[model samples]
Target chain A: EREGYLEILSRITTEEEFFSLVLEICGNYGFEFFSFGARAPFPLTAPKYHFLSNYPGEWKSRYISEDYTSIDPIVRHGLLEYTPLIWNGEDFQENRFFWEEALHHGIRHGWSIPVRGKYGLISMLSLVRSSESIAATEILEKESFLLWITSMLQATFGDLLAPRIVPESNVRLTARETEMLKWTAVGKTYGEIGLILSIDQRTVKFHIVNAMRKLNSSNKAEATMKAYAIGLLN
Target chain B: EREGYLEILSRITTEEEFFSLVLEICGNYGFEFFSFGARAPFPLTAPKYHFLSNYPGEWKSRYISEDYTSIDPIVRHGLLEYTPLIWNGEDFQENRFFWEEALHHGIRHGWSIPVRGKYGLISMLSLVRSSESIAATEILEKESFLLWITSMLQATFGDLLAPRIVPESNVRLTARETEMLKWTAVGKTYGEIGLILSIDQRTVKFHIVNAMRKLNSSNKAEATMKAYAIGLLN
Candidate 1:
């Protein structure tokens, strides 16, 4: 049954098919709920997020109304950190409010796979259950298996949605600032960006640092993500 | 030895340390050569490359010059697929010339772990040996373990070597910061630097991360080089 997941994912195109596929995974794997969301790297302004899950409707509404994706601690960490987050309440002490909000929606115990995919697409798959707490040993046993499933979903849902979104936001980045981040986002070094821009490397940093402060970010990555979240980058 | 792989990877700060670590893994795992390379999600022209391998220099040179990454069927497939490839020449029958060249380079039997990491960082970690052909069962047995190792290295080394545009010396590194950079400049690791300076492992990290900030570097290596360029590390 598990062996054929990829083949099924590769062919599915509709949301109904995805719903069935994910529900089947949950039914077989003994999970009460699962969520899958993805963001493509380009078109910075929009990436119709594939925010599908079997969680509560109310919780989904609240998350969207509050724009929780931008500040979700799990997402912030997952943007660059490559391990599955074997999480519990204590792990979210840094974001107490978000944790509390999640708990109210019956998301009491769970793990999320923040997967890296082709074309700079990032998709996260979360598995949750309210019956019992998950232990590291249990997660360790299923770590790769869970990741493998997420990979399939990413290729299926994430890639299926790809090959293309636009939205608007309040954040404003200058031409040079967004330009610097555009290169940085694609894995270019600062020096290389300077060469391409034909300006001094320090100038690139100045604009990027400005954007970072404007976006309330401490690092290049945050500014870029923040830029994308708010549709500041083109 | 494998028990602490993550811990060691978390603290290493030198290229030599990376070579030693990968080589050690190869020896223990019965792999004669190992290579790790990645490209980030943004700026298609960027990602330059984060390639490190134990293959013969001549082969590496030829591959680099030939620009086979764009045409190599194995890499092309690996870029999108989430499976480990137990490659033999037959897999590349369509690309006979490249396969023949790979053989000339002493690459006989091997399997590669194609990894997806945060920030849409897609990387491939390859294990090769000349003595025997790889088997499906052999790869299946170690698939998860190999993926874990690749994830660890991608988080550590990939982040440490990420590219940045430039750094201005307006905000000089602290005396403590420079010491951390200096130790790393001399091939010392965060663990070793901590040991020699009486700082704990996390404390050493604080300085290096801070120093990287001051240097406007994408990674520790770049930060160390900048420190030397700006006369901060003696």
Candidate 2:
């Protein structure tokens, strides 16, 4: 059974084929709808983001036109963490507008898993059931399988789509700039970092300014986060 | 076969049981050894960490006694990133000491998948082959299975053992402190944040100092990372 799934996954050669294959896999688990959201980590304000869903076409358009992605709890949570999030109408007290609309469209019960790939590409796969409660035991039993499929889907398709999805930007930091950012990442004040590195506070700030400029970041925290995401700090 | 695997996984009642089942699964994929390392997020100087490996007992002791965990590239990389890392002895160009020592003990080709759970728990599962290369197809085919197993193992045993493994610490941030940290996380300077929030720069510094203290982080970057880890900033 595992081999068969792998064979199908390996043979997938197009986006449409990938989506259909995923839909079939979700169908095997008794899900009525499925969606995958991919986020790229560049141009922080307008990074490359994509969503492929097999939901009702009307709801899909509404979700986009309403700018629902900005306030989506699942997408927000998925980008920041790697845990599996199980949600229903009850889980959306803060974002009831999105929830009520989704429920009206028959997206009642759902499960989402975030997959993080190398180079700051994060994608989430969500499987939704229209009207029934998704049993905890079913989730427990098949969670790993679903997660594996999500990772595979992201790897196979996410790679091919990334270049087209987000135009590549090259940003490089010098050794001193990287060191300053690393120290900043650990929360050091300029004065304290100067003492630790046996440099003047002015020098520390200078390096930070260069680092932030290269990373195209507005501030220290954003620079640190973006630098870490791109593997510069590591 | 997938159902059988899930059933066995769901029935696992103890950490030992989980380990043995994982060993069985690895054997199916021709891996001879397996190790799972879990890292907790608090007490930076001495974070709670655990390692369960099926390698030669002698090597395990040497690894611990020599304090190689701090330098082992796989462990370091695992803690920092979520991507699957595949390495052989040949990959360890910089860390010769750890690599030569590990190779001497029969750890040849290896692959590690890092699983990040909610509440700042990151665990990695490593599969090792003593005499053969880990085929790309095998990895591509079984990657998800292995990831699922890793996640399940952490969710099950990591939860059960978390209290005993790492005593929970209570850290709370005030709403203002959280706001300051959130802005700090995005690279805002104290003065810039003050302007945005309509507060004094001194007030920003004070809130930051308090947040840093509450998080037990020596620096702002570390505090921000920890805050993000524990979902405080989210």
Candidate 3:
């Protein structure tokens, strides 16, 4: 019942079906609720995230209505730490009303796994139950399979989840384009890169701006970061 | 034999002592060799990495002498993938000679865990045995503890290994500094930022440059990424 997910994931063409399978997998582990969210790797200022969850309908509605994303401690913690965090009143000292509401809605006992991956891709998966307090021993035992589960989810859904955030980054770069960005990343000025690569400064800008268009970046900073994160300039 | 690491990590003051303790812990897991490496989060072109390993001395020396950093598939895989990789001939198809040399040095079986963390921090920890091949079942069984161990290592040694690559970033940023970079990250020009923040463009440049020094970044690209990565801008 637990194995053979790789095959199942490959066949999953819809988010609805993916969610159904995810719920079944979580059910096997005694979790009644699960939330998974992933974000693109670049444009750190304006990150694009996709979230899926099976929490109470009202709670989800209220969460957005109240703009809890700005105040969610779990979001704050996940942004700053790469560790799995077991949720409790400890994290909600300043947001007791929110915490109490969450508890009242059966989002009481859960742990959030913060996954930071290649190209700065980040995701969080939380498995929650209405009762039966989560134990240290439980996490120690279940973490491997859960981590594996999160990895599978990320691999299966990253394209959809992260979107074409690094648009055309999926497009292959010419060797020269790659080399140009490599030097740019090393702090070479266009003039310096021109002398180093024996191309004109305009030629250097030509390659770089062309790359910017391909990477869907508006500026050199964003383009260079995208190129590096997407493994094109490495 | 396997708990209370939060306290243990707090007491580890020296790398040698840390390595000795790591050896003891790995010994319990039946692993004969372990290597841990971490790198600073910035300076994409010339990343500074610190590596500690119990691998054979001659192999380590030859690895450096041959500049294998340019060719090591483990490094390449660890760089590009966030998943744990079980090293086999599959990765060494193009570097059979290097693989043979590694096998000659008893570097026969291993798995490498790639960890990507907050602020773009990254680490890799490999646990290996000379004679016994690592199995999928064993990895399934042991990955949780190993991930736990790697987390412990990162938490403790990050300051030492990642160095001051983000030098003064450990310093706190004011709300003004934070807001400045957030807008900057959104691609606002200095003049635009000044107008938006109700200050002179020179004053905007002043605040941004001050932050650049604090982030140890030589340019705006590095500075914004550093601030965002370090959680100041978020």
**What would the per-residue lDDT of candidate 1 be over residues B1-234, giving only the tens digit for each residue?**
345675788789877898788888876878888877775533323334557888898987888897877667666655556667777754566778888878777687777877765434567878888777866667667766777777777666655655431124344778788777666644467788788989799999898888777656777755654454333432
lDDT of 1 by residue, A9-100 (tens): 77788878998898888757768888888765433223346578888898889889988886787666566466788667545657678788
lDDT of 2 by residue, B35-113 (tens): 8888776543245678878889898788878788778888888765666888887677887887887888779898888
> For candidate 3, lDDT tens digit of each residue in B30-114?
8788888765556655566667788898877787778776677888777777777887633567877778888787677877888
lDDT tens digits, residues A55-93, model 3? Answer: 999999898789777778888877777777887643566
TM per prediction: 0.63, 0.72, 0.88
CAPRI class of candidate 1:
incorrect
Error of 1 at A181 (Å): 16
Candidate 3 yields a Cα-based lDDT of: 0.73
DockQ of 2: 0.38
Better of 1 and 3 by lDDT: 3
Q: What is the TM-score of chain A in candidate 3?
A: 0.86
Summing lDDT over every window of 10 consecutive residues in candidate 1 chain A, give the lowest-scoring window: A162-171
**Where does candidate 3 stray beyond 4 Å?**
A164-169, A182-187, A196-199, A229-234, B4-7, B89-91, B159-169, B195-198, B228-231
Per-candidate DockQ values are 0.13, 0.38, 0.46
The per-residue C-alpha lDDT of model 3 at residue B99 equals 83
Root-mean-square deviation of every model: 12.4, 5.3, 3.0
